[PDB]
Structure formats: C-alpha cells, structure tokens
Design an enzyme around this catalytic site. Structure first.
Site, PDB file in Angstrom:
ATOM      1  CD  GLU A 135      -3.826 -14.481  -4.990  1.00 13.44           C
ATOM      2  OE1 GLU A 135      -4.057 -13.397  -5.059  1.00 13.44           O
ATOM      3  OE2 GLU A 135      -3.191 -14.680  -5.374  1.00 13.44           O
ATOM      4  CD  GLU A 170     -10.023  -6.046  -5.257  1.00 22.76           C
ATOM      5  OE1 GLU A 170     -10.468  -6.360  -6.010  1.00 22.76           O
ATOM      6  OE2 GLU A 170     -10.275  -5.058  -4.662  1.00 22.76           O
TER       7      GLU A 170
END
Lengths: 244, 243
Positions: free
Chosen positions: B67, B89
């Site tokens: 991730e 992100e």
C-alpha cells in the site's frame, strides 16, 4: 423536441409498473412532465445521431429508474420494468443539512432524496434550484410535489459537470474525452462512467455489485425498446472512482 | 506484547529504506508506534503457533508495505525492501467524499489515502475513528501526523470483519471457515484471500497482476526473515472477488 424520439407509448412501456398500486409515487411521474422538463435543457436527447440520442434518453431513464426502483428478481416483466416506483427517500434518519456559508438550511426543512435522481443535501438543492430558477433551498419538497421541477432536478444533475466529474450528458453522447489519468484509472467512455459520476465512491472499482448490475439492466432494456445497441463499457467494476 | 516476536532490528531490516531521503514518510513510521498500536488489538500477532504469529506479522507488514511501497524493479536491495515509503496518497485529485448521513464529510477535510493501509473515504475514516476512539471525520490527517493512530487504522482494517468479508486476521491465522459461496467462488484460506479482502475487485479472479506479485514479494521476504513458510494459496488469480 424529444417527443418524436420517445413517444408517450414508449415512455409508458419503459416505465411499465410505476403506476401499480404498490408504488408510492403512483400517478406523480407523467410523460408530459418529462417532456416539459427536457425543453429546459437544450442538447438533452438532441445531441448526436438518432442512436446516440436514444442511448442518452435510455441512460438518463436507466440511472433514474435505478435511483427510484421498486424492482425485484421475480417482478412482473422483470426488475428493469419497475423504475420510478418511489418519489421520497424511504425512512430518512437525517435532515441532510451540512455546514455552508452559501447554502444555509431553511428552518424546519429537510434535504433527503427526492425525485428521479434522489437529489440530496442543502449543498445540492441550493445550486440545482439556482440553475433551474426555483428556490429549492427554502422549498425542497417541490422536488416531490411538482413533477416538472422533479424531472428538472434530475436533468440538472445529468447535464451539469462537477469537477473533476464530467457531465453524464458529455459521457453518454461521446463529447467527453478521458484524460491520461482517466485512461490509467480504467475510466473509459460509456454507460459505466455515468454510474461512476452518480455514485462511483461506493459502486465502482470493487468488481461486480448488484447495484451496478441493476443500473445496467434498466439501460439495456430501454436500449432494446429503442432498437439501439448499448455501446461499450457498460460496467464500472474496474474503474477507479472519479474524484469529489 | 509482540516485541519478543518481532525485534526493533528485524522491523528495521524488513522496512530498511523507509527512512531514506527519497521517501516522503522518512522518520514517521517508528517501531515504538507499531508495538504500541499492536497492544490496542488483542490477538494481533499473538494468535496461533509461533510460525502462524510470524505469518500474521509478515502478512500485515507485507500488505501495508505494498500500500505504501516506494519500490521499483531496479530499486536498491530489490523492490521488497521499499515498504512504508509514503504517508499520504500522491496527487489524490479528490476529497474522497461519498456523501453519507452516517459518516458525513467535514467541510474542508479530505479522506485521501493515509498511513500503512492507505485508509480512504469518509465511510472508512468514520467507523475506523469510532472503533479506535479518534474523531477521524474532523481530523483525518491524524492518520499521517500521529504514527500510533497511523498504525491503529491499518490494524483496525486488518482485525475488523466486514460481512461478507472475514477479517484478514482470521484468514491469515486459519480461524476463517470459507462459506459455501466462498468455496464456489474459489476463495480459499491463505495470503491470497487477504489481497481479496483489501482490493479483490481490481486485483483478484482476473489473471496475473503486478500489484498482486508485489504484495506476495513483500510477504515472502518477511516470512524469509522470520524463517517461516509462506503457507498456501498466495495469489487470488482464480478467486472471485468478495461481495
């Protein structure tokens, strides 16, 4: 006028069971109200070749049919004949009021889902009402008592881009050009991308979902009735959601 | 606590590039934060025989490594040494708001990927915050600024069943009993089902994916360091995604 492309008969065939005794919106959603609402949105069902215009009407009636569906698997004439069964959100447990300098919630009023796109939240009733020329911030239930306003709220949603989302109108008519970003995200033109704009956060990019299956069933049946092909990319199962 | 099962030195050998200048999360993801977060989740790394406990930690760190990976094929010490490189992100291009009366979006807040599981969306920050006793709807960036909360969001995801999905915890420990539907769907116990839980819609039942190979590469390397076997069913290439 779209009245040539979609006759009263075709409309009633598509929305076959909306006036069955079991449907709470029985008698509300009229062909005349749809046609009167569409006039307020030049380009709606009048953009592209005849096949593309019919795909746009099928896609609009498809997505709204899903938002208002009374369908079930063993339903008479199949689940894709039970569009437009309800008008007001079932058992809302919120006023759908959200802090906003621009869109102050009106006293005693609630912004739960109303009409064919189940328009929700003060911050959506505000700009929608501004766009169509009605004070829906202060008179939200007009979306559930005036069938022309009801249809206008759904056409407002369909026709209005909201960064970074294109309009469903531009997606379905082939006006929308995917960005390199979109292409990497699997966001390709077609019916799938209209689902992504409507509720992609919950429904897209997680494989098969019965909700997206339902949106497709309606679109396909309406395309079948119009005698036009579906076009490509009907699901958003491999599309990353559009931004908010 | 699990500090006896995974040492500071083992944790740092596993996550050996996370504190490089080339990594935005440099200095953030601490061994102390990991161990502290773990104590809040009874059973995490303390469920099963020694090799099962190590597979759980390897699996948790492998999936979270994927991730947050800074890896690439020609990376120093190979791509499976580049876990925990990112915090936030990159270029979200979204507030990650799905209007919810239950977990409403706070004005001016964004729910883009943060921390080891890249927790995303108001409808995940909401129940995660509720579970760990933090207001993540009003303060979502706590997942990128507090390393204990950061690990706790990933452990919440790992430990929490979401019907019809079992917890990653029950899958990796072998507690999970696949349903009739799961059996029909080719969903079988092992690391592959944890990939299915995390991102099966895009990654499972649809052939080879570099993302799945990356998740497996991290898990295998961490199993190799622990000196334990991988177990079976490492990919999800023939698993229908969970509903």
């Amino acid at each position: 006028d779209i009245s040539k492309l979609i006759s009263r008969g075709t409309f009633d065939q598509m929305l076959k069971h909306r006036n069955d005794g079991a449907c709470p919106a029985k008698g509300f959603y009229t062909y005349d109200a749809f046609i009167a609402a569409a006039k307020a949105f030049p380009g709606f069902g009048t953009t592209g070749d005849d096949a593309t215009r019919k795909r746009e009407i099928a896609a609009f009636l498809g997505q709204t049919s899903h938002e208002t569906t009374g369908g079930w698997p063993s339903a008479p004439d199949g689940p894709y004949s039970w569009g437009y069964c309800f008008l007001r959100e079932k058992n809302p447990s919120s006023s759908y009021c959200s802090p906003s300098p621009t869109y102050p919630c009106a006293p005693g009023k609630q912004y739960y889902g109303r009409g064919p796109i189940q328009l929700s939240w003060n911050y959506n009733y505000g700009p929608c009402g501004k766009a169509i020329g009605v004070d829906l911030l202060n008179n939200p239930d007009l979306v559930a008592t005036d069938p022309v306003i009801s249809f206008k709220t759904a056409l407002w949603f369909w026709m209005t881009p909201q960064s970074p989302k294109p309009s469903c109108h531009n997606v379905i008519t082939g006006i929308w050009k995917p960005s390199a970003a979109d292409q990497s995200a699997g966001r390709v033109p077609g019916y799938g991308a209209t689902t992504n704009i409507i509720n992609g956060g919950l429904e897209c990019g997680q494989g098969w979902k019965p909700q997206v299956e339902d949106r497709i069933g309606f679109y396909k049946r309406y395309c079948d009735i119009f005698k036009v092909g579906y076009g490509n990319n009907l699901d958003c199962y491999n599309q990353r959601p559009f931004g908010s």
